Structures are given as C-alpha cells and as structure tokens.
Paper text:
Recently, a newly identified type I-F variant, known as the Cas8-HNH system, was discovered to lack the Cas3 helicase-nuclease gene in its CRISPR loci. To elucidate the molecular mechanisms of target DNA cleavage by the type I-F Cas8-HNH system, we reconstituted the Cascade complex and obtained multiple cryo-EM structures representing the target-free, partial R-loop, full R-loop and ssDNA-bound states.
Furthermore, we also determined the cryo-EM structure of the Cas8-HNH Cascade-crRNA-ssDNA complex at a resolution of 2.9 Å with a 56-nt targeting ssDNA. When aligned with the target-free state at the Cas6 end (crRNA 3′-end), the Cascade complex in the partial R-loop state exhibits a maximum displacement of ~7 Å, while the complexes in the full R-loop and ssDNA-bound states undergo displacements of ~22 Å. Since the target DNA mismatches in the protospacer sequence are not tolerated by the type I-F Cas8-HNH system, we analyzed the structures to understand the mechanism behind this high fidelity. As aforementioned, the HNH domain swings away from Cas6 and is thought to adopt a catalytically competent conformation in the full R-loop and ssDNA-bound states.
Author numbering:
A (entry chain B): 12 to 233, 236 to 332
B (entry chain E): 0 to 254
C (entry chain F): 26 to 97, 102 to 107, 111 to 116, 125 to 338
D (entry chain A): 11 to 335
The structure:
DNA sequence: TGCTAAGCGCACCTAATTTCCTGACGGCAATCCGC
C-alpha cells in the first residue's frame, strides 16, 4: 500500500445533538422547567478600541452605539438546565469514502487490533469524564454553587454527578458510574452494540437573574452579537459540546511541560494555548502514513490519538 | 366531427428542462406542444382518432431547482454527472455542461377535434398520461382529466399568451435591444422560446435519429409572453398555442 | 503562428459543441442572411452580433483566437500599425465557414410537425447570441441568472472563442410571477390532518357510534387540539365524497345511515382535516350539534 | 447482417423514482401525526486541519477557518423521520425512444421477448424490491436507528410492512411473500403485460429525539458562497430521485470479481461505483461488449450476463455507436 | 327554528433636534478535458 486513497473520508462516531436551555429552581428541579429566551440589548458605549493618533483626537469622546443580544435568567429561577443527547456509532462502520479496498481492509485490521488490545475503553472513559466534569458548560461553569449532571441511557437514569468535584486536567478511572457508561460506549465503538443514544441533562445553580451565555453565531459579511436560538429558546451549538467532549488528548509531545488536555485535532492546534502541539511526526497524517502505509507498531498513546480522530472524522484524502 | 375542450388539471412535473441557450426558467413551448403531439400519437395508436390542434398553458406553482442568494439572484443546481458516452467514458468523474431544471404544476387545456369526444377519451388520456413526459420531466401526479364547456370550469391559474406587439413596438436598435428595453418597461413579461428557424436546407445528413424523415439544422427563436388570470381571459382561443409552419420557420403562435 | 494557423480555424455563429463538448467533428453554422427587424422573434440575424466566433479544433492553431482578443480590439479590422507575419493581412475575413455536414447523438435532435408529416430538427446552439446577451445584461437590471457550470477546460474543449471568454454566461430569467412560487405554506395547505384516535379501539364506541357521553369532551378536545390554527379557505379544503361515508359504515355494516346520527369529521374539514375513514365518528345529532357549536366558538 | 449498433440508440428509464420529502413524527403516533422538517443554516468556526504543503503549514496551522453550512435535525419532541417517495415502473420495450436501424430494433425486441420467456424480469424485480425493503435509500439515515419500517402501496393496496433492519445489505432474499407479491407486478410491468405501475413507499426511521437528519446535498457552483447547500423540496428537506435510484440499482452481484469483493454495486455501463475507484467491469464483462456479443454476433450468453444487460436497459441511457466525423 | 329593516362613522393643525453606530483573525481539501 503506497499513498492514501484519492477519496478518503470518515464520519463522526459521537453525534451530539444541539442543546436547549431551560430555567428551573434547584429544590424543584425534578418537577418544573421554563423556557429561556434571548433578549435584544442595544448598548451605548465609549470609543475604547485602540485608534491611531490622528483618529483618537477626533473620536475619543464620541458616543458608540452598538447592537447586541443577551440571555439572562428570571428573578424567580436560580438554575440553568441544558439538555442534549449523544448518538454513539461504531468506528468500522464510519468510513464514508475509500477509493481503495486494500486500504479499507488495512484500516479494519488495525481497528480490530485496537479492539483486541483496549476495547475503546480509555477513550470512552475520557469521554464520560468530559460528560461528568461538565466541560460543555464553557462560560457557564464559572461562578456556580452546585453543578449536577444526570446521564440517561435507554430508560435508566444513572446516579448523578457532582461535576464540581472533578478536576478538568485529570481523568478519573475509578468511578463506578463513569466505568459503567464507558463500557457501553466502548462496546458501541467496538461493534458489539450497533448504536447507543445517551441523553444528558445538567443543572447549573448559578443564581437569580444571572447571565446565561449561549453560543454566538458566526457573521461573515459587514456585525453584532447574534446568539443561538434552538426552537425559540436559547441554546448551544453541537460543535461546541463536541469540542468539549474531545478535550481528551494528553498524548502530545509536550505534555509534561503543559500538563492539561487539548482537543483532538489533526495538527494538534489549541486555541486556548495558542501554539500548535502536533505540527510534525506526531500528527495524524504522519501517524496514518506510518500505521497503514508502512506497517509499524506505534505506541499505544499514538494509537489512542489515531482512533480519537477516527471518532472525530474528516476528509483525509490525498491528491 | 366533434370539437371540444379537455383540461388536464394540475399536472405536477418533476425535474423538467429549463435551458434554451439564453433562458433559464419556463421550458420551451415546443416542449408542451410535443407533449400534446405525443399524447395525440399514443391515443391514435390505441385506435382513438383525436387531432389535438391547440394547447392552453396554465401555471399554478413553480420551483427552479437551486437556491436564492442573499443578493436576490438565482443559483441553479445540477445532478452529479454519471457515465457520459464518449472518449472519457471510463473515468469516474464526468464533465459538467450547461443545464437547468424546473418543477412545475400546470394545467393543459387542449383543443380536441375527434369523431367522439366523451369521458371515455378522458379515461384514455388518464391511461396515456402515465407513460409520457412533459419537457423532459416525470409526472408525479395529476388531479383530474375533465371536459370543460366555457371559461368558468377552468380553475384559478395564470396562463401564458404571446405578446409580440409589445416586442415589435419597442425602443430600437436590434431585436435583443428591443427585448431588453421591453422587459425594462413591463416587469410582468417574460422571454419565451417559441420555436425554430432553419440554418440550412431540407435534406438527408448522416447521424439522424430517423433516417427516413427529412432533416434541417435549426436555431431557436425567442419572443415575449405574459401572464393573465383565468377570470380576466376573454374569449379563450387566445390562450391556445398552436403549431404554425412557413418556409424556414417552425413557429408556435397564439393566433 | 498567426500566419500559418488561419487555414484550420473556422468561422461560425453556431457551434455544436456548446450543448455537449463530446460531439465529434467540426459541426456548426454561419448565418449571415438579413435582419427582418419586425418579425416577432430574436434570431442570430436579428440581434446585433457585433463580434463573430472563431472555432478551432486543435490547441496549436489557436493564434487567431488570441489575435482578435487584444484590446486597442483587432476587431477594428472592419489603427493600422504594421510589420511586427504577412498572410495575416485581413485573412481573418475570408476564413472557411463552419458548414453543417452531419449529425450525432450529442446534438439535440427533435421532431416538428410540418403539414401532416414531420421534420427532424437537430438544434445547433448560438455562441454569438449568448455572448451578446451576456454583454447586454451586465449593463442592465432585467431578471438574470449566471450559469457557473462550464469549466475553462471544457470551454477550451468547445473550440469556440466567445465561450472561452464567456464560460459562465449571464442569461435571462423566465420565471412565473413570484406569488406562484413554492413554499412550505403552499404545500402544508395541500396536506390534510388525520385524527390521533382509532375509532376501532376507542374504549366506549358501539361499533361506530359514541356510546359514552364523556367521550365527547375527548372528541371535542382532539378536534380542537389537532387543527386549532389550521383553518383553510374553500379552494384549499378537501372535497367531500360519498364513498367515504359509505366506506365508514361498510366498516360495521349499518347500510342506511343510522337515524339520529351524523358522520362527524373529528378534525373539521374547514380547520384542516382529511376526507378519510379515520376522520369520522357516527355521533348522535344532539352531541354533533354540541361539537359543531363548541368548535364554532373555538 | 447487423455489423454495428445504431447511430442513435436511446433508452428511457423504466424505474422512474420521484423526489423525496422528509417529515418528522413520533413513533407511537406515526400513522396520524406528521410535522414539517426544515433545513436550518449552521455557521461554523473551525481550524485549518487539511493537508497543505510544509511551507504553508508554518504560516497557517493556527489560523481560524470559518465556514458556511446548512443542517437538518429533528425536533426536541419528535424522534422519527418520515420519507415518502413514489416510483413509476414502465415497460422495457416501450422505453426505446430512438433507434435508427430497423433490424437492430427487431433483434433487440426478440432478445427482450426471449428474456420474458426465461425469467421474465422477475429476479431483477425481486432485487429492486429488496433494495426497497432493506432501506438502502436511507444512505446515512440508516445508521443509528432503533426501528426502520418500510411500507409499500401499489395502486391502493397497502401491503404488510417491512422490518428493514432484518435484511442484510449484501444478501438478496428470494422468499418473502410481500417481496414476491410486489416483484411479480413489477415484472409484469417490465414485460409489457401492464403499461404502468405506481408504487408509493413510506419509511419510518426511529433515530432518536433531536438527532441529525441527512438530506441530499445540492451541487451549486457559486463563487461568492461555497458551503453545504442541502436540498429543500417545497420548503422542507428531502432527497433527489437520483440518490434513491442509485440505491435501488445496487443489485449487480454478477461482476468478474464478486467472490473477492462480496458487495452489490450499482448497475452502470463499465461497472463504475463511486465508492471504489477502479472500474469493476472494464473490458470483457462490460455492457457494450456483452450486448455486441448478444445482438450482433448472436450467441447465448450466461443468464447472469443477461441479467446485467437487462438491468442496464432498465437503467437506460445513450447506447449508440462510437460516433464518427 | 327563526334571531330586522334604514340612514352614516368630521371638519384642522402637526408628528423635534445632537452625537454616533467597534476593534481581530479567518472564510478547506477533491473532482467535474476530447483528441
């Protein structure tokens, strides 16, 4: 096998639904829910952007009218409720395009070898650790008295999670609930179970009339703050929940210096720490050209990274 | 023998043609009259002699296959090209040519002159409009094939009539400039493909679809038309597109 | 180049390769007859085709299609800078004309009625017209659509020059008026609601009729809930057949309509409903009057 | 004698599928409730994670990649997807719209009637009904589904429905009574014993509550916008007829190397699936050679090759000779 | 099983003015050529 196929692509194996926001009261959290809506907020400002010295003289005491939007809780509610659900799909049944059949056979052989060693269990334990620590609450985890994340698969509600008792730079491998959910995600990733739909509900006690931060939408041409409305109510993008669920990579070359996980991307880009962490031989392209194109038994940490990107997906196609 | 009017009500055409060299929109009128003559030739082969000599073209809904951009223009889609006969027929990616496609709901009022024009002929058309295509598009469903008497049983819809006097009496220059000026003056007027003018003489060339019928190379000729409601249409007979031939001109006209 | 390539470049108003670029041979036409100016139609002899089309076969002899495209245009050859090639001295005006000599499966061939017989018409598209339309609709505001379909390789493969300059042409938009355009509302107004309760399991139904009196709250509630805000005008309502009321009783015998009972479309046929065996329960005339008055006040 | 193919041989489709429309429903009220499914616009902020030259990588590895997209997802309270499409089965002899030579028309009509005599379009029809009853027309909507239910309604008779997760996508069943009942009518429609057949298919896919629905993507070439432009039919999501038809023509299991690659491919001329990038039938078992050995150098080809030639003629297309100048 | 018939629903004057309306980075890879 010389060179990757001309049309090689992979589909997701962790399909996350879009998130809807609700308001509750924490002592009535199991019997009461209200819609949370986005409110337009025009704001008047001062001209505080940095200007060149021949523009600051004319526009330093000039009013700055700006349009914007916001989401805030009611005066009778102390808790934000976010509801999303995740569809777990198998990894071998996710190659959407592969122009060569030998390359398909080689990918299936190496995934079967990984199922023989570790049945997608460390990766799944890291995913349930990013469901249990509530990393999907990006700016909604700052300033919270109690965060409770409940996970429901099929019709069983698993015991709830004290999300604030989980460090975001460590991964627990001794929690019974995380292991029991992660074994089901592991068997779904392996192939034993054909699909797994996992529904997540998280209660964030932030306070009364406090601000809830949704996902801001992208504007392209020449704009203001447009926040995400899912079915009228406020909400977050599925992309943002998945980038907080793929923050599992502690296998990059410079981990002992920067001791925290990063999201799993092809070239190892991290927007928090603005440095590329996998720009060369430890990138997916040079770890899939040395696992299948020139057969080499890679270290297990690198294998974790390759299967994590094969759960993420993408167009990995040569010219 | 027995003149009459059959209405083929609300025919839903899916993925018809829409490209006629300079037009992306309503198909050619020769295509709808070809649906008429194909219906005629298939009925006359079940031993039902019915000469169709005039077609009404009513319009209820449309969807050009594509999307409308933010600047209010149109982007036309195409299906992914498959194996196209030629030198490059074994390559997995084929060339993309100029093509546009439309979805229409239309009602066709036909001028039918046969020995007997009854409701059995309507049943014959129902059993004949499910093996034919309008332009090059499939018929998903039709409401009803019925006989009409006057301009009151006709459903609501906007017909297409030929407006050539709004094109001959136009600004100046050449016929393209007259067309562009006329479309600037009346914004409820559309360009329409109306037939063909020969570029050669009648003869036998090699490569014909039928080697025994005469053949002539043609360009498409185009004109103007507009939309009139069913209520405000006077004495019908002005929505009835009919074939008309001359020496070198293959034209579809509303007389 | 420009004095030894003028003998294999042909002159056309019409190329066959602009419908499909796999049409064998050098097929096309050069129509130069006359403008009628009052005929009612736009032909290539009735619009102002200012610049002709030079169609090639091989990429080597593409020098006339380059010289004629350098702005000063050498199209000035109806000023006279000379001698920088001698054969080229206005030999771009007695070029061989593209003559139609055959047909193929890729040229669009259709039949046309001529006097009880038929004439096969193989349609050749016009390059120069399309070029003139694209020039005279950039400087205009009539409805227009750009066809971004032909790549430069296939436009080069067409052999034409006014397709290599204009590969993505601007053409007229002949669409029906905008109120006749498809949307969700003009389609969710052709679909009819059906009720969420099966009459054959309704728990209190006496083989078609409404035995229990407390089911009329349920029937009224479902008739409101399904279809409260889906009122339909007369043309958008479903037709009221008699085969449906017959097929309803057919379900339980009851040949004559039972005296004192009227077929009730559970969801109303004005506020959205289907003329179907599902959307009918043979309720008593008293309770039918109650339900058709309850839905009257909504 | 016949020494070539006609100078204009054309064939029309005999399995004319219609565009699809997507609906959202519940499952315990799937026969009564039906809600519209709309296609939203989702804009994304990404990273430049595509392969680029090693010089461009140093300049662009940490650069934002904003992209435009569209997406169809279900509601928070409806867990199923309803796709309803229709087919128009037509005769094979009455789908030849053009043929220049009369003797080729006579010979091809003799070969179609000989196919009506021995296995009269029945095995092909059973394969087409299997490609309705395993729900291969759910291209990426068949993954992650709890219950798939497919209902076929010829004329006005509603046939017993299918559990489309109990059919393998690589094995064609020839024993189910409903499939045989539908397939005999499709075979009689292909023979010419019936002039037309209208089949309406309605599917119910229980994927989950707010999960992603995958319509067909439109090829729209715009220079200003380059994003995922999905298909909207009458305001709501759907699928092209070509996608569903390419699903239904995946019946070819008679290619020269089926024992190695053991999966059905779509019935094309040179055996050109869009998944595997090698032509599967490129010289000796291609349609052009296997119809010039059937009609021109008369010869009784094996029944698998006759199945392939008849399946091409049900697919239809421009099937003439190498056009000359 | 009915719930009325008839006429008509103003004439004037106007609808403010100032200062301004952000800074950033970026917007994919593949493939669509006959001869």
């Amino acid at each position: 096998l010389k060179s990757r196929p001309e049309n090689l692509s992979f589909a997701r194996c962790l399909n996350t639904t879009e998130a809807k926001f609700w308001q509750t009261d924490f002592l009535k959290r199991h019997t009461f829910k209200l819609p949370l809506l986005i409110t337009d907020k025009a704001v008047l400002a001062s001209k505080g952007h940095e200007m060149p010295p021949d523009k600051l003289e004319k526009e330093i005491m000039d009013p700055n009218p700006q349009k914007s939007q916001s989401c805030t809780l009611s005066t009778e509610c102390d808790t934000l409720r976010i509801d999303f659900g995740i569809k777990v799909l198998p990894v071998k049944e996710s190659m959407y395009s592969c122009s060569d059949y030998n390359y398909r056979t080689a990918i299936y052989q190496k995934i079967d070898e990984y199922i023989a060693e570790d049945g997608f269990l460390t990766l799944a334990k890291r995913y349930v650790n990013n469901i249990a620590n509530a990393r999907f609450l990006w700016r909604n985890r700052k300033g919270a008295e109690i965060i409770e994340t409940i996970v429901t698969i099929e019709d069983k509600e698993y015991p709830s999670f004290n999300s604030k008792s989980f460090n975001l730079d460590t991964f627990v491998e001794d929690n019974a609930t995380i292991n029991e959910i992660a074994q089901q995600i592991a068997d779904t990733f392996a192939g034993k179970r054909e699909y797994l739909n996992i529904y997540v509900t998280c209660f964030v006690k932030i306070g009364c009339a406090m601000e809830v931060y949704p996902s801001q939408e992208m504007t392209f041409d020449d704009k203001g703050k447009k926040l995400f409305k899912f079915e009228g109510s406020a909400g977050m993008h599925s992309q943002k929940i998945n980038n907080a669920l793929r923050t599992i990579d502690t296998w990059y070359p410079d981990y002992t210096t920067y001791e925290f996980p990063i999201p799993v991307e092809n070239y190892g880009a991290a927007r928090s720490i603005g440095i590329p962490f996998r720009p060369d031989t430890k990138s997916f392209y040079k770890l899939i050209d040395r696992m299948i194109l020139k057969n080499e038994d890679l270290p297990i940490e690198d294998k974790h990274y390759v299967m994590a990107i094969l759960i993420r997906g993408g167009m990995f196609s040569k010219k | 023998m027995m003149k009459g009017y059959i209405l083929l009500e609300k025919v839903n055409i899916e993925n018809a043609n829409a490209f006629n060299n300079i037009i992306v929109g309503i198909p050619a009128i020769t295509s709808f009259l070809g649906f008429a003559r194909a219906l005629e030739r298939k009925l006359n082969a079940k031993e039902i002699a019915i000469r169709i000599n005039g077609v009404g073209l009513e319009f209820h809904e449309y969807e050009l296959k594509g999307y409308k951009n933010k600047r209010g223009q149109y982007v036309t889609s195409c299906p992914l090209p498959g194996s196209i006969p030629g030198q490059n027929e074994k390559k997995l990616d084929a060339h993309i040519m100029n093509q546009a496609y439309i979805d229409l709901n239309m009602s066709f009022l036909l001028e039918v002159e046969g020995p007997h024009v009854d409701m059995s002929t309507c049943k014959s058309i129902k059993s004949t409009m499910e093996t034919l295509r309008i332009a090059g598009g499939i018929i998903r469903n039709y409401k009803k094939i019925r006989l009409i008497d006057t301009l009151a049983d006709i459903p609501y819809g906007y017909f297409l009539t030929l407006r050539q006097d709004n094109l001959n009496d136009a600004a100046g220059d050449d016929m393209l400039d007259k067309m562009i000026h006329a479309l600037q003056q009346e914004d409820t007027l559309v360009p329409i493909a109306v037939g063909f003018k020969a570029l050669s003489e009648v003869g036998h060339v090699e490569g014909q679809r039928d080697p025994e019928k005469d053949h002539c190379f043609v360009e498409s000729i185009f004109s103007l038309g507009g939309f009139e409601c069913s209520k405000i249409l006077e004495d019908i007979n002005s929505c009835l597109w009919r074939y008309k031939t001359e020496e070198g001109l293959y034209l579809c006209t509303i007389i | 180049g420009l004095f030894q390539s003028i003998d294999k470049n042909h002159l056309a108003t019409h190329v066959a390769k602009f419908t499909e670029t796999n049409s064998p041979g050098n097929i096309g036409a050069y129509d130069i007859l006359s403008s009628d100016m009052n005929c009612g139609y736009l032909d290539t002899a009735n619009a102002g085709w200012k610049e002709p089309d030079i169609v090639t076969n091989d990429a080597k002899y593409k020098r006339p299609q380059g010289f004629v495209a350098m702005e000063m245009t050498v199209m000035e050859h109806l000023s006279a800078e000379l001698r920088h090639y001698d054969e080229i001295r206005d030999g771009i005006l007695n070029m061989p004309s593209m003559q139609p000599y055959r047909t193929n499966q890729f040229i669009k061939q259709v039949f046309f009625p001529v006097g009880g017989s038929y004439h096969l018409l193989s349609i050749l598209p016009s390059t120069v017209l399309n070029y003139e339309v694209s020039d005279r609709l950039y400087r205009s505001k009539i409805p227009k659509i750009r066809l971004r379909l032909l790549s430069s390789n296939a436009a080069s493969t067409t052999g034409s020059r006014l397709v290599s300059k204009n590969k993505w042409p601007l053409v007229f938009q002949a669409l029906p008026p905008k109120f006749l355009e498809k949307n969700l509302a003009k389609a969710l107004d052709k679909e009819y609601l059906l009720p969420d309760i099966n009459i054959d399991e309704l728990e209190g139904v006496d083989n078609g009729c409404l035995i229990d009196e407390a089911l009329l709250p349920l029937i009224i509630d479902e008739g409101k809930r399904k279809g409260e805000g889906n009122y339909r005008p007369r043309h958008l309502r479903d037709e009221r057949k008699e085969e449906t009321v017959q097929a309803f009783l057919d379900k339980y015998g009851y040949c004559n309509i039972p005296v004192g009972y009227e077929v009730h479309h559970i969801v109303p046929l004005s506020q959205g409903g289907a003329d179907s065996i599902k959307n009918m329960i043979m309720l008593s005339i008293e309770h039918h009057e109650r339900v058709t008055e309850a839905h009257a006040s909504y």
